[PDB]
């Protein structure tokens, strides 16, 4: 089902096996860095335990990282069974194309991992640098969706820890700030009803 789909849920507890296999996984995990944080975070062990391996046979993972998650995110990436083959840099600008501990941070990083042997992807159409305006805090650029679509047109994709503004055609979005469940793919709907007959994910 081409149109946007999503599932409001705690990604620690959802049985992601009901969702099938995807050509692309993208995640923007709420890494446990520093302290406080305006949102809920996942511990390092919770991140390691995420059932990412069931989501793909052959495809690409896009994993946003920052701070010490540059190292932890590599750990998870490898643990989940991927090899990191690229690293996207989002250069953060204002509306006039000016860039916004030891150094000021002009950018954020997206690790690119490969699993299996993906075939029929259009490797090399885009470059590994995004220049795009900052929006709300932690809002990632929409350019990444176009890069991923040109890389793998028409295929099914899943985003982890997406917010409502993240839902896109051809994507299933999971996150705990989404509004309810919106599923249209009949195969997914069937397996969702079989696994969660009372619609209670817990």
């Amino acid at each position: 089902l081409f149109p946007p789909q999503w599932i409001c849920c705690d990604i620690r507890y959802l049985d992601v096996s009901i969702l099938g296999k995807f050509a692309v996984v993208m995640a923007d995990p709420p890494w446990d860095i520093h302290m406080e944080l305006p949102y809920g975070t996942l511990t390092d062990d919770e991140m390691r335990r995420l059932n990412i391996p069931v989501l793909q046979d052959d495809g690409f993972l896009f994993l946003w990282v920052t701070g010490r998650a540059m190292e932890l995110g590599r750990e998870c990436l490898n643990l989940w069974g991927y090899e990191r083959v690229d690293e996207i840099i989002w250069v953060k600008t204002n509306q006039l194309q000016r860039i916004i501990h030891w150094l000021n941070h002009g950018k954020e990083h997206c690790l690119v991992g490969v699993k299996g042997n993906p075939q029929g992807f259009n490797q090399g159409l885009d470059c590994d640098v995004i220049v795009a305006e900052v929006r709300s805090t932690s809002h990632k650029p929409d350019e990444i969706y176009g890069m991923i679509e040109r890389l793998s047109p028409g295929t099914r994709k899943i985003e982890l820890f997406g917010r409502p503004h993240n839902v896109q055609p051809n994507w299933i979005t999971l996150g705990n700030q989404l509004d309810g469940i919106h599923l249209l793919d009949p195969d997914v709907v069937a397996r969702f009803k079989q696994r969660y007959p009372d619609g209670i994910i817990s």
């Binding site: 083959v85 690229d86 860039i99 950018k107 470059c127």
Partner: protein, 238 residues
């Protein structure tokens, strides 16, 4: 405006469209030791002869990927960098754009550092609007990892992509490093004639001349100058 779609359409990299301290540089210039340099084949050379222990190490091994004597990450990882680094000390490691982003982090941890910054050299192609097999994307940047051991600037360098076969790194990296005021013992491993610079000891296989003397070099940091940051005034003599 979607610069990624634009690059796909025109070949102009998104970074082509990014639109773009004095007294400090003078203090750095004052405290700088004279340039010192040594020709050494680092594979065969006992780096322990490089004394005293360094406050900053810039490590620029010539990777195979720069050309399209090369050093593999196998070679680099076996360097005994921890033997010449001061207990509190910094490293800056040019890791390229491939497997080095992973293996360079292994090196840093192997040598006792933790990464505190990831400095990205972003290469524009405004003058000329081909990939490694695993590459998913066109690679238009390189990474210099900053590491720390013991207890003004941004993490981006944007310059036009150099001519093919030119493996020089942007001189801006030296300005970032020197602006941190990290100490005055600075070593540049795999530097070249063209990178020799006041305030730095340059060691590399292609150097055509040497002037390094361990005793003379150490004399620059003898008391009262042992702990200067390289950003303060000279200590007055006589």
């Amino acid at each position: 405006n979607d610069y990624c779609q634009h690059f796909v359409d025109t070949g102009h990299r998104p970074q082509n469209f990014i639109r773009d301290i004095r007294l400090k540089d003078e203090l750095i210039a004052k405290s700088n030791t004279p340039p010192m340099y040594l020709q050494a084949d680092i594979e065969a050379f006992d780096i322990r002869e490089l004394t005293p222990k360094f406050d900053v190490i810039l490590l620029e091994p010539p990777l195979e990927e720069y050309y399209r004597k090369c050093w593999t990450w196998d070679d680099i990882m076996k360097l005994e960098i921890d033997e010449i680094a001061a207990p509190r000390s910094f490293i800056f490691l040019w890791c390229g754009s491939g497997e080095g982003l992973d293996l360079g982090r292994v090196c840093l941890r192997k040598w006792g550092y933790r990464r505190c910054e990831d400095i990205c050299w972003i290469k524009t192609n405004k003058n000329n609007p081909t990939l490694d097999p695993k590459a998913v994307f066109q690679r238009t940047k390189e990474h210099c990892l900053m590491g720390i051991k013991g207890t003004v600037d941004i993490d981006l360098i944007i310059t036009e992509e150099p001519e093919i076969g030119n493996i020089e790194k942007p001189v801006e990296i030296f300005h970032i490093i020197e602006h941190f005021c990290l100490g005055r013992r600075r070593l540049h491993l795999f530097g070249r004639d063209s990178t020799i610079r006041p305030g730095w000891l340059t060691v590399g296989p292609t150097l055509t001349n040497s002037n390094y003397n361990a005793e003379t070099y150490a004399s620059y940091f003898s008391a009262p100058n042992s702990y200067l940051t390289g950003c303060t005034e000279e200590i007055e003599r006589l």
